[PDB]
Design a protein around this ligand. Structure first.
Ligand SMILES: NC(=O)c1ccc[n+]([C@@H]2O[C@H](COP(=O)([O-])OP(=O)(O)OC[C@H]3O[C@@H](n4cnc5c(N)ncnc54)[C@H](O)[C@@H]3O)[C@@H](O)[C@H]2O)c1
Ligand SMILES: NC(=O)c1ccc[n+]([C@@H]2O[C@H](COP(=O)([O-])OP(=O)(O)OC[C@H]3O[C@@H](n4cnc5c(N)ncnc54)[C@H](O)[C@@H]3O)[C@@H](O)[C@H]2O)c1
Ligand SMILES: NC(=O)c1ccc[n+]([C@@H]2O[C@H](COP(=O)([O-])OP(=O)(O)OC[C@H]3O[C@@H](n4cnc5c(N)ncnc54)[C@H](O)[C@@H]3O)[C@@H](O)[C@H]2O)c1
Ligand SMILES: NC(=O)c1ccc[n+]([C@@H]2O[C@H](COP(=O)([O-])OP(=O)(O)OC[C@H]3O[C@@H](n4cnc5c(N)ncnc54)[C@H](O)[C@@H]3O)[C@@H](O)[C@H]2O)c1
Lengths: 334, 334, 334, 334
């Protein structure tokens, strides 16, 4: 498989490392800067530490353990040399091309003009697109796909959890909060942003912001369309997040132990192993940094009242779990 | 009225500043250190800034704008000279005397052998104590009371919210999470703690921890006994917290606009003004720092799914709002 | 006088507040966004708190306590209507126009094409310009000036300190470090930046970065040209910084007491009162937040070895002290 | 070698992990808590991640990858069973026994009454003690030593650096600052502390604090006695620190490149390899997290003004580099 990455940022760089480790042929990276900057950011990661490979930069390329990866600095995805380079899958991780096509550009440009076979959009699309969450609607992948969204980090945490709860107990409806690490969409100090909350100094506050992630479960689990909604609180941690899901279940005599038992068992099945995890250790968000699961249920936190009213907490490394899924998905598309 | 403060910490010092500004006669402070240290901590507050008063220290006292306050350093409260000093109300804000008595003392030592007329415990009691949340069960205050708890900051945020929702719509059940500033009960870096989550570096992680604050709503709103529970997430901000309440209401056609409507109305009443606030500004936690309200509904976040299943978010400065309540309560007691 | 602000950022908004309080006629603000965003950022400051004034927005204006300030969104400073509006002084605080002229624009555009009388550049110029540091070279202010740099925050801390030490003891040479709050020039998480140090997650690390602030002392104190250099360390605080100055003095038997005595005396002189402060309180960076001085000597930190080898530490709020100087300077120009 | 650790904290646990990897027999840990808490802290580290070994707790013991280690909970070190357990070297890392003896115990209790053969004090002694900095005064180690201090993390950074500079160029005098991670000696929010600056919320400020680390260089390099002094600034990072050394050298025509060349060359010698490191990458503090060097010169930062007046910066993980030296020292003592 020949991979290209468009947007060598937090997701782009984690995807790179995970894919490189698997022996995938990463042919080219496109961003808006020079090879020296990209090589330096790849080598030294504030969140995850020092990359253990030999990293160099050259004219038009970075070199990783002797493997040379082409660097492009092309703002307009229509202009990318993907056919020339024989690109099988483009990872679209710039954050700025979440419509199919546009005046400034769109994710379908990678396939329709630039000549790549396939594109994975690393964010929910603003329009209609095949959306996959691994462990949830894997079956929806076929060989003829040209464009797929891997949804959001939060949907990837929430959808597997909701799938198991719905299949076991039935969800009538649910509301959620993600208490969520800050990201590069936010601001270091107060500065203009179209979202007036995200305008605010990110390491100084708990910052409410809207999320479509709970509604988006309906795209991958149609039975739950219209049944889930929620909100997000951006807090001052650099990575690591937690979904806090409050559900009304159809099983009106459901207990804490029954909920934890089905979640534990589900995490051990071949369909969800490595995707849904379960723990009973009293951990904190730092403990999940670099964890490849989409969703790790904190069993100690499960809380149940009468009549199927329940709260489930599930951890995820919003960068690393999600990036592993993007690579998992790339390999399945081929 | 003569006030003494036992434990001149985050709560003790805020209570001091609020009471002093009202002209209350603050007779003495007891802690475990010298007057120079207490004067310095009073003068320079990392969270709220420099105290705009002349602060002096001397042998056995501090002086604030020419008013002398005695400093005591007695670890066992049974030994405190409250009768001799004529103390009407002792504020018990050490964090270590949350039982009535023990082989190392308790909050009743203040009103039994030490001889103060009354004690406010600035935390829920580990045993049973008369518990008051202003704006909610003011009627329970009578001149015969000796010992009262002002409950927790979180209960002070939640209970007024619950009161209004219950009176307007009826509350079937609800679950909550507080996304909560770190406190001095936590650890700067990983260090032993009886709570293995609170053992962890407080500025580095989202840290789940149990809370009795939702169940405690039942102490002050007896109709809601058994109907609420929840959890806490401690996050890296030094003050400012938010209650995220997910509630099943009895009014099945309730809308978000209706919910915001009754909360906004309640905020303007004489019973709840100064206690329950309401905003529709897209604020963040740093904006509620130093706000004296117990509970500030974030109107933009209100959300209803189907059939009375609703989500409501409310801000509180866990130090400052709560400390104002402690002073308000002391004044009501006499 | 009629003031305009170009770039309503950290400096721009603080300059606004300080100027407004002085009754200065702030005619217009230019930035890159709408009035609602600008009003919201003025009202709610993560660093400094809630602006206690009635702040409103309308089409092409914000209103503060009933006073209307025009809002413009014009990227090219050549196109600004300063002549039409009668602007006496423009504050150039976008950070992107530090050359007099350029293809994209420069600070002189405000006067030569846009028709304002005078411009203050809120940063060192990349070219030759009149550079003023109040308390250091005030006499260089003449009524015919069209363009002036107020230098940097760090030069404003360092220059008055160097002036006093040089006048009293003589500086042979000096090296310095500023331990400095992060700024909007930095990144919330690792992201491309022309400076590979400033590319890194700003709240996560100590970040060395170059500074010309010590060389720049030579612009306002010619006797110290070529005599000072230094470096910066950006650290995870949102404002508040400290100069750490290590100097070789000409007085070879100079003592800590003598150094502190001249600094304390200088801080009480008409020339430097409100510019250079001196303290002997054991404070930390939070305590200088919102302080209007350019430089506050930490007297307890003064350290002297043999032969005039001395170390002096001086605090500054890099936003607020500097912003106060910008407004002082505006008033001196007219 | 039989090792015991007294004080299983940040240093004690890092020492444990390093020693464990080397096959050192860790016989016993003493602290003030139970085995579950110590096992939990060992397994989950907020700073360094999840420990990749099976960790279990039982009565009076923990087990690490099948190796059993005794857990003791004895406050007074004179009562420790070191003779009975055959302890060769005790690591004294509680932070509360920095005097040889007192009415509450001291470091010599380990070797006098408790009956260990040797004790390493992981801090400068408050009284006189044989002090070793590896890479500097190794020759001072002999078989007759009963009690030694490994000095401080800052002395371990500064001393190897000063050694090379003095050998190559001669040091006349020097002054330094360490910009330094917070530690458990500090406070999460403002709280009493005998050091009024260390009393202040650790993650909210730059906090000046005194240090004997530069003067202590004279203990391990007698030619530099009385020639160095310095101060510390505690800043909001959990680990990772940097020494900023301003030094007057004897070679008056020395250049930045010359300084860097001797430092680079010294870092490759058998005496200093693994102790003194050298880089020319534009790194930040997060990048030295988990680095085992005592001192890593930041070559890009090296600066020379005139006449041998120079500035050198060197990184250190104050926890991990120092803890590696402690283990190195333990092995050299036997
Ligand atoms: N960070 C997370 O936790 C996370 C998780 C899941 C999904 N996502 C999604 O992934 C996407 C990227 O997120 P991120 O956090 O990596 O962002 P980021 O800001 O760290 O990286 C974006 C990168 O794309 C580059 N870029 C911008 N415009 C470009 C263009 N026109 N052409 C080429 N390169 C361009 C930027 O220089 C930058 O390197 C976003 O859509 C985000 O919503 C993020
Ligand atoms: N911080 C908050 O947000 C908050 C809010 C509501 C209630 N509370 C409660 O208020 C109490 C105090 O909390 P805090 O955050 O101010 O704690 P803190 O640790 O900041 O202050 C405790 C103070 O009491 C002193 N002290 C300890 N033992 C003492 C003794 N035996 N005699 C006299 N003084 C002693 C300490 O020296 C310290 O000054 C706790 O019960 C806490 O749960 C805290
Ligand atoms: N923040 C400090 O500590 C500090 C201290 C002294 C000097 N300065 C200097 O002041 C300047 C501003 O710094 P800041 O920290 O306020 O930056 P900031 O990023 O907070 O503000 C910059 C503002 O200018 C606006 N802007 C950008 N391009 C523009 C354009 N073409 N036209 C109109 N507006 C535009 C941005 O939207 C933003 O609102 C910089 O030159 C900086 O070096 C900063
Ligand atoms: N953290 C650093 O960067 C660093 C670097 C070099 C040296 N040091 C020194 O190492 C020592 C330990 O520092 P730390 O940061 O690990 O401290 P820490 O507070 O993390 O750990 C101290 C441990 O000792 C335990 N303890 C306290 N009193 C005890 C007693 N009487 N008996 C048994 N155990 C007791 C505590 O429970 C705790 O687990 C200090 O002397 C410190 O100055 C620290």
């Amino acid at each position: 498989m020949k991979l290209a990455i468009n947007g060598f940022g937090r997701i782009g760089r984690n995807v790179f490392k995970i894919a490189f480790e698997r022996g995938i042929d990463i042919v080219a990276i496109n961003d808006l800067t020079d090879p020296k900057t990209l090589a330096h950011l790849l080598k030294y990661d504030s969140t995850f530490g020092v990359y253990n490979k030999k990293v160099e930069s050259r004219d038009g390329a970075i070199v990783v353990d002797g493997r040379e990866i082409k660097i492009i600095a092309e703002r307009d995805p229509k202009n990318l040399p993907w056919a020339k380079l024989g690109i099988d899958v483009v990872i679209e991780s710039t954050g700025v091309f979440s419509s199919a096509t546009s005046d400034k550009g769109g994710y379908l440009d990678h396939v329709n003009h630039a000549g790549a076979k396939k594109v994975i959009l690393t964010v929910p699309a603003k329009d209609e697109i095949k959306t996959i969450v691994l462990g949830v609607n894997d079956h929806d992948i076929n060989s003829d796909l040209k464009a797929v969204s891997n949804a959001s980090c939060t949907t990837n945490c929430l959808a597997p959890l909701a799938k198991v709860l719905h299949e076991s107990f039935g969800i009538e409806q649910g509301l959620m909060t993600t208490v969520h690490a800050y990201t590069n969409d936010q601001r270091i100090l107060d500065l203009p942003h179209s979202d007036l909350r995200r305008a605010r100094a990110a390491a100084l506050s708990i910052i409410p912001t809207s999320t479509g992630a709970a509604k988006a479960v309906g795209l991958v689990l149609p039975e739950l369309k219209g049944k889930l909604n929620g909100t997000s609180m951006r807090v001052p941690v650099p990575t690591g997040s937690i979904v806090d899901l409050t559900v009304q279940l159809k099983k009106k005599d459901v207990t804490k132990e029954e909920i934890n038992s089905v979640l534990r068992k589900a995490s051990e099945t071949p369909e969800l192993k490595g995707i849904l995890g379960y723990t009973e250790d009293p951990i904190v968000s730092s403990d999940i940094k670099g964890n490849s699961h989409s969703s790790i249920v904190d069993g100690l936190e499960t809380m149940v009242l009468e009549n199927g009213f329940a709260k489930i907490l599930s951890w995820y490394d919003n960068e690393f779990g999600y990036s592993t899924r993007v690579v998992d998905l790339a390999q399945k598309l081929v």
